[PDB]
Amino acid sequence: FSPINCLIFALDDTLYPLKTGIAPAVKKNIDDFLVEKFGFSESKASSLRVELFKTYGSTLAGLRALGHDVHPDEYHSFVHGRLPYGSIEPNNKLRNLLNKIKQRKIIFTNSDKNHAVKVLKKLGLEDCFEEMICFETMNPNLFGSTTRPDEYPVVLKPSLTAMDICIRVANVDPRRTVFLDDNIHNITAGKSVGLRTILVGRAEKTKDADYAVETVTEIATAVPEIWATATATGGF
Numbered sequence: 001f002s003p004i005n006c007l008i009f010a011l012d013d014t015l016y017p018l019k020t021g022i023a024p025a026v027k028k029n030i031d032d033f034l035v036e037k038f039g040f041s042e043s044k045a046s047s048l049r050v051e052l053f054k055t056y057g058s059t060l061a062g063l064r065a066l067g068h069d070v071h072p073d074e075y076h077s078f079v080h081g082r083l084p085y086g087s088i089e090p091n092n093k094l095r096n097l098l099n100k101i102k103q104r105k106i107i108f109t110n111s112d113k114n115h116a117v118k119v120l121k122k123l124g125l126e127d128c129f130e131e132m133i134c135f136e137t138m139n140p141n142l143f144g145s146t147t148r149p150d151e152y153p154v155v156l157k158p159s160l161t162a163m164d165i166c167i168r169v170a171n172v173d174p175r176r177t178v179f180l181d182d183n184i185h186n187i188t189a190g191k192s193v194g195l196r197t198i199l200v201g202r203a204e205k206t207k208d209a210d211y212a213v214e215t216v217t218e219i220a221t222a223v224p225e226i227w228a229t230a231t232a233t234g235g236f
């Protein structure tokens with residue numbers, strides 16, 4: 001028996017379902033950003049977005065790695081600031097569940113804090129989490145202090161550097177912590193640093209997923225150890 005003292009949640013397409021429609025809007029906004037920046041065709045923009053997302057986990061990270069001094073605020077204002085936030089549905093079931101859960105709850109998102117806070121507000125979860133590790137948390141040196149774009153490379157999930165930042169800032173014991181995320185590479189990363197893992201958004205587990213649920217509220221029944229009251233580890 002291994003107790004769970006902490007639950008760490010990704011945000012986008014983890015705490016709201018993919019069908020919400022934010023994911024396609026983000027892709028479109030990134031493409032529009034690249035067209036605005038570089039005068040690309042839309043086809044070339046999309047091609048570049050997917051290339052940079054695949055290689056660096058983020059178009060912003062990718063642009064900066066390629067020498068372009070794009071300020072995170074400019075990027076997030078365009079790409080997240082233009083999102084259809086009204087499309088995110090409140091989820092009282094999820095709110096009720098998180099209120100019932102006695103474990104520490106932490107947000108671990110690649111998105112910026114401004115986006116994260118707006119999303120949680122729409123969901124009605126604005127007071128459910130104890131800590132938020134977001135883009136800024138992982139990239140302190142991209143703000144204020146001027147740098148060459150290669151000086152402080154953007155740190156984001158699935159990097160193990162990102163995982164460590166979450167674990168240190170939130171002060172968690174990976175042995176007692178479950179990580180929920182909709183992205184398989186993020187799940188693999190979390191498993192590598194010793195976390196228990198829940199793949200959100202699919203019913204079928206990947207190799208590094210201890211659990212998999214299509215909707216995050218399903219953990220109420222899919223992971224019964226969340227309700228276990230024993231405080232210390234033990235065998236049988």
Ligand SMILES: O=c1[nH]c(=O)c2[nH+]cn([C@@H]3O[C@H](COP(=O)(O)O)[C@@H](O)[C@H]3O)c2[nH]1
Pocket residue numbers: 010011012013014023026027030049050052053057058059060079108109110111112157
């Ligand atoms: O370069 C990209 N191409 C994409 O298709 C894409 N879709 C989502 N995003 C970004 O993913 C992050 C989602 O945050 P979570 O850690 O909370 O799921 C946030 O940082 C989003 O901006 C994309 N970035």
Ligand SMILES: [Mg+2]
Pocket residue numbers: 010011012013014182183
């Ligand atoms: Mg996600």
